[PDB]
């Protein structure tokens, strides 16, 4: 039987959570995690210390900031105490935190500039602003580049505009395809 896949995710390049579905094993087994980097100065693989436990079994591991080297190959090995080795690019796994401090500036009557403060370098992040109207129930999407300023030139004061933004580590510093969690929507 194949070992469960490890789904590593870096969060704002602060900590990495790696998880696997150990429930698929018929016999509950505490699967061990050994991780390292290719072409590193240390030839000794690192054993997981901050283990995550779910259903009284090892569900994953957590790595701190000084263990996260983007732009280097991260090799993860799930070992059965039969091994599963995954070669990963953490640059394509960084999930940023949601944009913070959303604020709308009324530059003009028809112009609305949405601005948000992100908890990571703005250049590495491409944002996706979804705005919704009382009639336009479908969340209209407009991708915004590293410059975090979304200027809608056609707005209606009568319309109750709702805005929500999700960042992504894309494309300048990495090619991550995992969008961040939606921020708290702001109404106008």
């Amino acid at each position, epitope marked *: 039987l194949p070992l469960p896949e490890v789904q590593c995710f870096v969060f704002n390049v602060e900590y990495m959570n790696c998880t696997w579905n150990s429930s698929s094993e018929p016999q509950p087994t505490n699967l061990t995690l050994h991780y390292w980097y290719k072409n590193s*100065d240390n030839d000794k693989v690192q054993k997981c210390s901050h283990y995550l436990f779910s259903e009284e079994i090892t569900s994953g591991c957590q790595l*701190q*900031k000084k263990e996260i080297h983007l732009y280097q190959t991260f090799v993860v090995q799930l070992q059965d105490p039969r091994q599963a080795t995954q070669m990963l690019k953490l640059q394509n796994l960084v999930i940023p935190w949601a944009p913070e401090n959303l604020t709308l500036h009324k530059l003009s009557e028809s112009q609305l500039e949405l601005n948000w403060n992100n908890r990571f370098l703005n250049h590495c992040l491409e944002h996706l602003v979804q705005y919704r109207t009382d009639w336009d129930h479908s969340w209209t999407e407009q991708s915004v580049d590293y410059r975090h300023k979304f200027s809608l030139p056609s707005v209606d004061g009568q319309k109750r505009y709702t805005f929500r933004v999700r960042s992504r580590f894309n494309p300048l510093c990495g090619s991550a395809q995992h969008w961040s969690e939606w921020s708290h929507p702001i109404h106008w």
Partner: antibody, heavy 116, light 107 residues
Framework: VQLVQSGAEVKKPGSSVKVSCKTSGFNIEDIYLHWVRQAPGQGLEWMGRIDPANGKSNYDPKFQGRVTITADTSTSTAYMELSSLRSEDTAVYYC??????????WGQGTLVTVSS | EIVLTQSPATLSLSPGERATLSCRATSSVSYMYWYQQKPGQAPELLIYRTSNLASGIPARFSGSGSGTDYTLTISSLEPEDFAVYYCQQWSSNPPTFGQGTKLEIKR
């Protein structure tokens, strides 16, 4: 994840000083522990290294006869013992750790002041 | 030992400028590592393997070089950038540091 070293020691010439470095947040035997001293108002000076898993130690030729670096994996703590202390040995001794690339982690440094 | 010479001994620049620090080795080394020591604190790795930034290091820092000649570049200087920088080698035993370049504030 920290390296905690012992307190500052005032020693007399001709004695020995044992500096300890206890590691938390990872396994001692999973890293390479280097010892680097810095004299007051001087640059960094590498003293030695140890692979705690195997117990093998490599010493800088300057201290090859005088320094001894050992490790205890049970307590996850390494020791650097410098004998035949001289006033030229007054320095801040750091324990650094190689985990992935370079000297990732550094100890806060133990000041050893050698004076009669 | 591969003696590393770091120039200048002191580099006085105002904040906002670009700083270049040079390490020259007596013999060729595979990589260069850069450490930042603030006064009263332990050294902190910035650059590993001659170009790669350590964890938590801002993008202002850059590294380049080959053979004997290596350079650390700071595109923009900031108040927290004025410290002592040390170039280190691991190619030949024993590991060797540079004597340090104190980055100074130029008034």
């Amino acid at each position: 994840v920290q390296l905690v070293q012992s307190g500052a020691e005032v020693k007399k010439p001709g004695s020995s000083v044992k500096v300890s470095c206890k590691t938390s947040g990872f396994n001692i035997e999973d890293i390479y522990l280097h010892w680097v001293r810095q004299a007051p108002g001087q640059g960094l000076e590498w003293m030695g290294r140890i692979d705690p898993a195997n117990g093998k130690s490599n010493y800088d030729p300057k201290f090859q006869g005088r320094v001894t670096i050992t490790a205890d994996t049970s307590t996850s703590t390494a020791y650097m013992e410098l004998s035949s202390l001289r006033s030229e040995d007054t320095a801040v001794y750091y324990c650094a750790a190689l985990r992935f690339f370079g000297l990732d982690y550094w100890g806060q440094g133990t000041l050893v002041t050698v004076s009669s | 030992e591969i003696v590393l010479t770091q120039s200048p001994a002191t580099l006085s620049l105002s904040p906002g400028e670009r700083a270049t620090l040079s390490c020259r080795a007596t013999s060729s080394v595979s990589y260069m590592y850069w450490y930042q020591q603030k006064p009263g604190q332990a050294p902190e790795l910035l650059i590993y393997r001659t170009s790669n930034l350590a964890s938590g290091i801002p993008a202002r820092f850059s590294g380049s070089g080959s053979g004997t000649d290596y350079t650390l570049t700071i595109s923009s200087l900031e108040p927290e950038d004025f410290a002592v920088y040390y170039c280190q080698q691991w190619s030949s035993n024993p590991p060797t540091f540079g004597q340090g370049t104190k980055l100074e504030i130029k008034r």
